[PDB]
Amino acid sequence: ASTDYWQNWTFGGGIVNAVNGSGGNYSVNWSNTGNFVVGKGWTTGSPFRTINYNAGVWAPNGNGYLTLYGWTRSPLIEYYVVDSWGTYRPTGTYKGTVKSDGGTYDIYTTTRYNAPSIDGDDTTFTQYWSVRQSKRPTGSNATITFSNHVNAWKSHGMNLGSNWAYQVMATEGYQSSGSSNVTVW
Numbered sequence: 001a002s003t004d005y006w007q008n009w010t011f012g013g014g015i016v017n018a019v020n021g022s023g024g025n026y027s028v029n030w031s032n033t034g035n036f037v038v039g040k041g042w043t044t045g046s047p048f049r050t051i052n053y054n055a056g057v058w059a060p061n062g063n064g065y066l067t068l069y070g071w072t073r074s075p076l077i078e079y080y081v082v083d084s085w086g087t088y089r090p091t092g093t094y095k096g097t098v099k100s101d102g103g104t105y106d107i108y109t110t111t112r113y114n115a116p117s118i119d120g121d122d123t124t125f126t127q128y129w130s131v132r133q134s135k136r137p138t139g140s141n142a143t144i145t146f147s148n149h150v151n152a153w154k155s156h157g158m159n160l161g162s163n164w165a166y167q168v169m170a171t172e173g174y175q176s177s178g179s180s181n182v183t184v185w
């Protein structure tokens with residue numbers, strides 16, 4: 001299936017020109033932001049979905065992530081498959097590695113408190129991360145075979161929730177500027 005969901009969340013200030021383009025295409029131009037996550041994907045995430053994308057422009061000026069991004073409820077988990085970033089590579093509590101789609105990724109968990117989520121402004125949730133050990137090349141058609149991450153997460157006691165919220169290929173930014181252009185299918 002092609003994309004049916006548009007993510008466009010900002011907080012904290014600055015500028016985020018998010019453009020919801022044709023098909024699975026979007027762009028972002030941002031400067032001096034607080035936090036933001038923009039992306040296209042699906043209203044209902046699946047553990048079996050293969051996300052295809054092509055980041056034609058990946059041009060963070062500071063801290064941005066090019067990442068699969070999504071939530072489950074039951075319990076509330078935010079997850080990531082970070083394929084690229086800018087000046088800051090995200091980490092947390094090291095759990096292992098997983099190989100998928102031509103890349104080796106480190107696995108991390110982090111627990112968030114008093115934090116915004118799909119449940120509201122002041123919530124607790126766990127984050128699951130797969131973060132590529134080095135930056136993925138962009139401009140080429142890419143696959144994230146998410147099931148590989150789900151299985152590797154489960155092998156380190158990191159179980160997703162059973163009610164799926166959205167699942168998108170995102171540009172995230174924290175206190176940064178930059179540009180992206182990404183197509184998702």
Ligand SMILES: O[C@@H]1[C@@H](O)[C@H](O[C@@H]2CO[C@@H](O)[C@H](O)[C@H]2O)OC[C@H]1O
Nearest residue numbers: 009035036037078115116117118172
């Ligand atoms: O859908 C929105 C979420 O994207 C948002 O979650 C925040 C996104 O930035 C991430 O870096 C943060 O960890 C997370 O708090 O919460 C609000 C919700 O509407």
